[PDB]
Design a protein around this ligand. Structure first.
Ligand SMILES: Oc1cccc2cccnc12
Ligand SMILES: Oc1cccc2cccnc12
Ligand SMILES: [Fe+2]
Ligand SMILES: [Fe+2]
Lengths: 332, 332
């Protein structure tokens, strides 16, 4: 049910701008940050949209023009795709899987190159799509450093304190095109997804839906991603997908989404929605200290077994045959 | 093809005294110990029957009478069964598997009690069967210590030296009844199976037949045993049994069988064959020092993964569901 923007500027978005999927979804709670319930949620590692942090307030002003202007002259990683879906991958890991067909491409460039590449498609009607996953470092102009300095550190630092989370680990700035999709994957890191321009729809799944979501083997370059194509799910291969239940939200300018450690997420810039900008902050979580075991700990466990079997056997291609040898007629 | 005993005392045994099984078998080499080929085999961890060690020569004289006589007055573990097959189990592990039905029974007693229990069945025609797995310790009479002192230590110690095997770990003395069966299992220890009275047929399988043989889960009291009932194999549950190929021999008085580390064995006192006596020596093997990986190392690996998952999860009942969660639609 689309939110209504102030001054009767109309409905923020509508259903037809959302992709359609086979699984059902519940809504993520949208709270104010001084609400206790939002604090409980963050401490319980459940997701929550905070509508009023002002975390990235100075950036709320950013568009394409302002940015080409002040960002500076440094290198920006620009990923490139062949469809709407943007399957990232780990470079170090291609050696493990010899006949691996990459559907994405990283290209370094300068902001304005990107901006033309994008204005071209805007004026010529092309199929191709772009994203800009580029970390934030020192190569940024005066006015952008200003902006950054205007972020709600007090708030974000105090949220780190009270949870015992470790250090801030990076700052991705992201800009992409209407319709773009990032497919379900999970990170091991606590995350604050801070929306700036355009609307994104985030679908999340708790760690304990591990078995309906089918992660690539740990050694595969697509590690941590889900193998199920959401637009076209193969229920013979992935029958437990049929049991998957999401948590959904649409975030827009000002909203901050807490994606907790280990939660799957799947992310779509709305169709017809125009360009998008987001900044996320990633924290490494509080180090481990207790049974029953929490789902994400079982995930941590599986990852390890799979890693070890990789060293021990001398060859990640044998992980699978060894695990099958172990279970057939033994544990299944 | 039964061996022919000296003085034309006739054929040592014949086919009809062997049980019948679905799998095929090749013969284990029968060598003399001064033959190089037998040395190669022992160094290569392949099995070999040595016909001429004299290892237990003084004991070749042992029967039931001589033994009730001189053995002394100590405690002898006597295991008791309900059919021909004698499924042993680990006591410590029953806690792991709540509804576990034990088909065997250990009973402490004194040699003569055993000897009556056995002479009774011999005179009354009963079904029940007995074994006597009893380790060798100090509670043995003068003439038995004599006998023991007469073993070919020089030989057996020199075989330990040249292989770098660790210490002698025990000495089982075993006596059992015609027809008795010990079902396929594997030990982690190098072993010399030294035959004294009666004939046994040993069927062995190399470590790499792990997947046709289906060991119980590591935490199960029957750990290290094979789940397939050889008299009645369930090919729907155990389809890779259909691919199993054994190494077979029949050992009699004087023959010494080297069962190498990790090799399955299945052992039957011949039918109509009378009582049997065997002494085995167990050595812990040379500690680990290289890829390709040898099958028994993969076995060592699987055991470990299964153990860890037991500590980590806090509960051996969850090992199986975790491993299934790990592979389904991921590695299978
Ligand atoms: O973990 C990530 C890495 C790069 C891009 C992302 C976009 C949306 C959510 N997570 C993301
Ligand atoms: O490892 C063993 C333990 C107790 C009895 C056995 C009888 C035959 C072969 N191995 C055995
Ligand atoms: Fe992510
Ligand atoms: Fe054994």
């Amino acid at each position: 049910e689309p939110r209504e923007e102030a001054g009767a500027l109309g409905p923020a978005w509508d259903e037809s701008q959302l992709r359609s999927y086979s699984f059902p979804t519940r809504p993520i709670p949208r709270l104010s940050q001084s609400d206790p319930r939002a604090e409980e949620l963050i401490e319980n590692e459940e997701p929550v949209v905070l509508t009023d942090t002002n975390l990235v307030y100075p950036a709320l002003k950013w568009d394409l023009e302002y940015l080409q202007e002040n960002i500076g002259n440094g290198d920006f990683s620009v990923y490139s795709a062949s469809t709407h879906k943007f399957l990232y991958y780990d470079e170090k890991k291609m050696a493990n899987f010899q006949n691996f067909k990459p559907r994405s491409n990283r290209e370094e460039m300068k902001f304005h190159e990107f901006v033309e590449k994008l204005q071209d498609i805007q004026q010529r009607g092309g199929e191709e799509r772009l994203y800009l996953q580029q970390t934030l470092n020192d190569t940024v102009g005066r006015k952008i450093v200003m902006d950054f300095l205007g972020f709600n550190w007090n708030w974000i630092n105090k949220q780190q304190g009270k949870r015992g989370w470790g250090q801030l680990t990076s700052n991705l700035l992201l800009i992409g095109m209407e319709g773009n999709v990032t497919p379900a994957h999970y990170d091991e890191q606590q995350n604050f997804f801070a929306q700036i321009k355009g609307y994104k729809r985030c679908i999340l799944f708790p760690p304990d839906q591990f078995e309906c979501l089918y992660p690539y083997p740990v050694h595969h370059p697509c590690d941590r991603q889900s193998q199920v194509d959401f637009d076209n799910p193969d229920y013979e291969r992935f029958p437990n997908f049929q049991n998957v239940v999401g948590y959904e939200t649409v975030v827009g300018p000002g909203d901050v989404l807490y994606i907790p450690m280990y939660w799957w997420h799947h992310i779509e810039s709305l169709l017809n929605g125009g360009i998008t900008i987001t900044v996320n902050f990633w924290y490494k979580g509080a180090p481990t200290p207790e049974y029953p075991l929490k789902a994400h700990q079982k995930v941590a466990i599986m990852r390890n077994i799979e890693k070890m079997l990789g060293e021990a056997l001398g060859n990640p291609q044998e992980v699978g045959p060894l695990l099958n040898t172990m279970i057939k007629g033994r544990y299944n």
